[model samples]
Target: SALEKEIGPEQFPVNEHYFGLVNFGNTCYCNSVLQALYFCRPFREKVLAYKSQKKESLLTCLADLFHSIATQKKKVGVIPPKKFITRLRKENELFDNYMQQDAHEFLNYLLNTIADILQEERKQEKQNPDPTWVHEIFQGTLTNETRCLTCETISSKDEDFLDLSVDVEQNTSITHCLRGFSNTETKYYCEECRSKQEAHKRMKVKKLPMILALHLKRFKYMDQLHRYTKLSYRVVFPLELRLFNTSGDATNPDRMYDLVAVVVHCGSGPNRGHYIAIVKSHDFWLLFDDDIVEKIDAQAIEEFYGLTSKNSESGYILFYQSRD
Candidate 1:
């Protein structure tokens, strides 16, 4: 009954491209889910090993090893190894009283351990061949919507052989079916429109790498900002529309926001330079989750840009000014 209900008649739409903008923080879900899916096998292996050895410490040691590996892999060009090591040690120390922790904490620990392992594996895979293969499985029914009578009859006849004719007919009724659309249909476009579309797509593809390079360059120029600025993830543009809240209420609006530009700077330091990137953000979110945002005093902007500063060396102190 369940299978029949699931496989019963259904209408399907084709040739529809879905797109949406997602908050940068939400992009982390992909990494989180991928890590979970990847680490399950290794985690099982470790569990079995621990059971056979009858040692509890092995779990912690394995976790620590995975954390170290992850830190080295993901923090490349971001944080130094020594700093990462120190941070890891401090984290481990904070979790020393594991007995007082709850099941959620243990679950989180396991998840984090898996994430670290996967991050390390991904980093290594970029350099070397990956031993493990990740396969994504998709299951769905295929439907043809062309208005060719012969083709439709053939499809219907095939469905009849499988006792699915009624279902297919109901799903692909004449009223809702795509009747006149054809890939062979050609539209004449002016040279300008064609060139503009091609250029637009090219720019969309190039935007991500350009943003990454610029952000890295900014880091080099303003090393002191690293302490206060948090880098968000790098997001790819021309996102699908499913990520937005599209309810028709007055308060609920559905529309894309163009990312015009992004500016990064530190509140203090003589070498501070306000890095800016200007672009048309019609179809993309400017920064991904974990992309960096610099929080600095408003006065620091003036001092850093040389707009107003009696003492050049006192620029750092300007960062202490409170915002109104």
Candidate 2:
């Protein structure tokens, strides 16, 4: 129908599905993130391939929702993930109300919850040291290194993350923000010096996952206003991406990634804003705003890179897949 017209009847991707989600109240946050996750190839495959014991949990609901969309007779249409949404809100009181929710927070919570479920299931049927599929898809390692200025001795600690949250700045690139994140920060305790010393603390990626999810810190809390204010900065993010913040001993330090999905935040404030997903599937970019799916130009991604102008739809959470 409309989707065919947008992509043209002859060129429409038969193997790909473009389905918009129905938003219940202010559930745009959930819908936007869900669309992103659905477009993520690895994640979508895993969820669709999941063989559930049929527990009334978020993961099971997620698998059911994915299957529903996958087996839809029509390639393009709308589907409401009511069961998953209900289970999500029921599990967490923060999302129970009709108030606007945070997309990044919802994504973080959902991924962690799925990992926990997988972990629990494995524990029941014995166990393996290998990471679960959730971790295999999204988990990465960060090395926090501290160097004592006096001793010049560096100490490193490793931490795992499902996503990397980067701070945003006015007229900056995603790489710049990442560089700032990995760059050294002054002041730290140094045991080598036997006292609190001026040490350089840095964070580097020790391991990169198959899919790299980056959350832009577009919201800043204003003390005077006593609320969160959105930063409409022009942060440039490339389509084919490469990260330079890897540790020297990092596995696959030269890994390359391609931008797969982005959750765009429309409006100027955090508490009151609409969310949409821009996804790349079958080499086509599509925008999903609740019950509407429209084809978009690859170059059009720059529009959501954000601008200094008021009320711009800016990219909030970005999903990048490694070119493996």
Candidate 3:
């Protein structure tokens, strides 16, 4: 149509790469997350590489969506999420309603669901542990340790995740937020203590994946207020992130990663907000806002730090791809 003709041929200008999405009602939430996934080179490559060995599955739909967006020449394309969302609601009830959903929540749920679908397919074939694939690429582990103050005994639980969610406060830096996430104060009835005693609970990143997704907890539901509130915290993030301080192990090979994509939030209220994606292509930053795509400079990208910059365009979910 007119948009395709206006955007011209399937040619990407020098130092630029972007694709737009036609919103479906309040689908900016979904569109932005998809754009972030689009910028992830390894994810696109991995999903595209997988061929349906058997019948068409839910995973097939995801693979096709990414493949279509990547191969299409149009500057803007509308994502047909009927097949994916239909299958998603059948297994999960969280997304049954179809109102404005949390982008970060949707992102994690989508990734985990995709990973689960792949695992089920592999299980039918009786495949063993998959490496550098679905779970291995985006998944990580957290060591949850709880220690009783009265009794020195410690209780530990290992939890796996597709992404890391760190709560940010006012003037929050990524380092500060992570450090605070690891340490928690709570009371637990321990087996060793046999009483409700003060306990120290700490969570540490046990493992890091090739593609690390960092979610800044910007929305919280207040019970007393009976509503969810948006937190426009001035979160400071880095282009190059090192896992030395964040990981549980010191010798982990995946220590450093560079920022490849950023899912930015452009509003203040939980109910009213706009989402966009700023991604790196050919070492250049490009902003994707539905039908509006443009190249952004290094200096422009630096303003997203949320310190001495535009608070209106706050950084939300961050995607870092391993340098190695």
The numbered model that scores best in TM-score is: 2
Worst 10 residues of 1 by lDDT: 158-167
Residue-level lDDT of model 3, residues 156-213, one tens digit each, is 8888888999888888688898788788767589988798898888897877777889
Residue pairs in collision within model 2: none
- lDDT tens digits, residues 189-292, model 1? 23333321211100001001101111111112336655532222121222112112223345533322221222222223222322221111222212211223
Please report how far candidate 2 places residue 234 from its true position, in Å.
0.7
Write down the TM-score for model 1: 0.17
Off by over 4 Å in 3: 1-17, 51-54, 73-98, 127-132, 245-250, 305-311
User: Top model by lDDT, which number?
Assistant: 2
For model 3 the TM-score comes to 0.84
- Per-candidate TM-scores read 0.17, 0.95, 0.84
**Tens-digit lDDT string for candidate 2 (64-149):** 99888888998899998889888998999999999999999999999999998888888877943558999999999999998999
Count clashing residue pairs per candidate: 18, 0, 0
Number of the candidate with higher lDDT, 1 or 2 = 2
Angstrom error of the Cα, residue 161, model 3: value is: 0.8
